[PDB]
Amino acid sequence: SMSVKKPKRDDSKDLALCSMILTEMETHEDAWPFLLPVNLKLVPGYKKVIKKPMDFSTIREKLSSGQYPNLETFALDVRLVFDNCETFNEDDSDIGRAGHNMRKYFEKKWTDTFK
Numbered sequence: 001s002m003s004v005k006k007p008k009r010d011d012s013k014d015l016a017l018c019s020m021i022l023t024e025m026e027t028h029e030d031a032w033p034f035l036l037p038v039n040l041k042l043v044p045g046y047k048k049v050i051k052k053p054m055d056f057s058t059i060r061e062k063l064s065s066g067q068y069p070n071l072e073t074f075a076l077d078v079r080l081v082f083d084n085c086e087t088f089n090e091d092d093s094d095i096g097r098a099g100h101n102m103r104k105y106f107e108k109k110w111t112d113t114f115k
């Protein structure tokens, strides 16, 4: 509260660490469904069903241009990619499995790096 400060985590390396994790995700062999925005004019149903589209190249642009206030907002966008994927794809489709694999990969890196 006012003039009563909680001890705060050192956040000075967060930008660099999130960039490193994003690089690891960008180069994973199962990243291919997520590298670019879904083409809303070629993919039936996507525009209407998925209210907040997100993809790795959009996350990279936002990280490079100071649009994440903190590391939690970055993780929210990464998780949005995989949440969208589950909404639109069967668990045992190629894209569906790819999403489950990539979420598992991300969450371990996140835990190992920050938690």
Ligand SMILES: CC(=O)c1ccc(O)cc1
Pocket: 033, 034, 038, 043, 084, 085, 088, 089, 095
């Ligand atoms: C990411 C995703 O759900 C998706 C769906 C259909 C595509 O043709 C490409 C990507």
